[PDB]
Design a protein around this ligand. Sequence first.
Ligand code: NA
Length: 296
Amino acid sequence: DQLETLKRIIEKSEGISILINGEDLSYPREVSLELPEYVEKFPPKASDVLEIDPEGENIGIDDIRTIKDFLNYSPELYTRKYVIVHDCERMTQQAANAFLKALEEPPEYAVIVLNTRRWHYLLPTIKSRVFRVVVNVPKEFRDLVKEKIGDLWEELPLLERDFKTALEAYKLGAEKLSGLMESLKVLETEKLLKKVLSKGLEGYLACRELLERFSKVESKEFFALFDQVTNTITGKDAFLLIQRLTRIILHENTWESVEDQKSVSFLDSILRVKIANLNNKLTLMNILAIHRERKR
Ligand code: NA
């Protein structure tokens, strides 16, 4: 339904800039990625679709130059050439400025697919030149995954807000999902730490498993586990683990008490702190202790 509406808009366009907008963590990105093949009914060769998604928190003017060079040539197999820019609010002022001509008047054969979850974060100059499209993960999809994985859906709260991870769970099915959870349960701590920073499902399950170890390790051995984790995961990796664990601790616990309100306020605050202003080990210790004691 969504993809079909876009397809029609695209087929009667002589160049178009679209912004796929949604509250889900990955649905805007996945809709963007599947769009070209949905319109063309053929899979994408690299000469016909370009994906822009830098590893950091900024999309610079250099990324915009890349896009502009790519758009100057015709597609090989496809009718149209596609550019996908994930989480486009990351564009710098120079990047946005440099992208106005191509965005307002893209080549007749071009489709620029930007995506974000924050429409108002974009400069009015981007908003003025892009056809906005709000996307929502349909109810039927949730009912479809719940029915495939059963009780595991309520046991994994992230799935309701991360479409792609919910889709990986749906592809594995009940037995393999339960089997993956058990494989991580028996895995050695050194090996488990190599997965806590992975993308998607396996990273989420590894994070859940590491938290459970901090929650259940015998009192005498808690700091031994903590030292082993903090000696392996440091700097930016530690900041990333803090962020991920804070999200899991927040979303996978209930907070009714007055004492809980102090803990929630602390957990909520961590999410908004920049890497330069946080003590990693002290923060990790506190979130894990919060979680461990909440579970007790
Ligand atoms: Na999709």
